[PDB]
Each structure stands twice: as structure tokens, then as C-alpha cells.
Amino acid sequence: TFQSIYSLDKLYPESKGADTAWKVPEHAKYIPLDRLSISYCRSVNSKAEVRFHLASADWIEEPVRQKIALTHKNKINKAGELVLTSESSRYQFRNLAECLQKIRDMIAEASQVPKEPSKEDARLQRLRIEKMNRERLRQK
């Protein structure tokens, strides 16, 4: 085993272990893939879909599960399993990455409190006027 002056052992003396790089981190932090159910359908390119039951989603914190459900109830299937899909690439890996990330965003946004809503856009402004107009209309 020829070892040059630039061999990784000399460059990084602390991490001289042969299996240091090829060992698996302890982890324990994370989305349990086993809990989720992942089905790939080709719509001539792939389309990913992740369907995990909210009731059986013990990994998710129970209080936050309540908040996520109502906030995005539309995405919740009739059986009660959140249904989320993405179709933006030919590689199931990248499409799947979108599916997983949206779960993280939903958990993060639910866990965190967006104290400031600030202003609304034109679409919401029109809806607010419509609701206000209806309220005065129902005089009886």
C-alpha cells in the first residue's frame, strides 16, 4: 500500500480509520420511509405519489397532526391519509424528493407560528369584499 505525502492518512491524521468514511452515522434524529407508502406511476415520464395514513402517522407529533390536517384538509383523502403528488421531471428520484420535501414544509410551517401575515394579494382582497357584501345583504 504505497502512501504518498498527500495520502489521506497524513492529510487528516485524526480520521485514519479505514471504515470511518464507510460507516453509517448514528442519526436517530428525519422522515420514516417505512411508515410512508410510495407508489410511482408513469402518469411518458414518471409521476411520484406518497400516501401515508395520518391516523397511523405516529411518527408525526399528535398535536401538530391536528393542525396540519385542517390547514391542508383539501389534500387529505377521504380515508384520512394525506395524498400528495408531484410531476415535474422524468426521474422518480427528483419527483419523489418533491413529495418528501412538501411533508417537511408542512411540518415546519405547522410547528412554527407565522405571527405576521402582513398584507394580502388581489385575490384575497376580492374575496374579502365578497364576504363583506354578503353579510350586509342578509339583513333578514
Partner 1 sequence: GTSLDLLRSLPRVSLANLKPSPNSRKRERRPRDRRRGRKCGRGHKGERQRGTRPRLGFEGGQTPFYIRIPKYGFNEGHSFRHQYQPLSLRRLQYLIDLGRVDPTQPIDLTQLVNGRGVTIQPLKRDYGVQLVEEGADTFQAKINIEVQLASELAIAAIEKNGGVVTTAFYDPRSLEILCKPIPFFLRGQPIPKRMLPPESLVPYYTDAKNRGYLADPAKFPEARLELAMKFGYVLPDITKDELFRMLSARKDPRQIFFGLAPGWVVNMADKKILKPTDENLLKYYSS
Positions in the binding site for partner 1 (CB under 8 A): 2-8, 11-12, 14-15, 17-25, 27, 30-31, 33, 38, 46, 91-94, 96-97, 99-100
Please provide the distance, in angstroms rounded to a whole number, between the alpha carbons at the two ends of the chain. Answer: 93
d(CA 55, CA 31): 16
Nearer to partner 1 by Cβ, of 27 and 115: the residue is 27
| Cβ burial, residue 98 (10 Å; 0-12/13-18/19+) | middle
In the complex, the smallest distance separating the C-beta of residue 22 from partner 1, rounded to whole angstroms, is 5
Nearer to partner 1 by Cβ, of 4 and 133: the residue is 4
In the complex, the smallest distance separating the C-beta of residue 25 from partner 1, rounded to whole angstroms, is 5
d(CA 106, CA 79): 20
In the complex, the smallest distance separating the C-beta of residue 13 from partner 1, rounded to whole angstroms, is 11
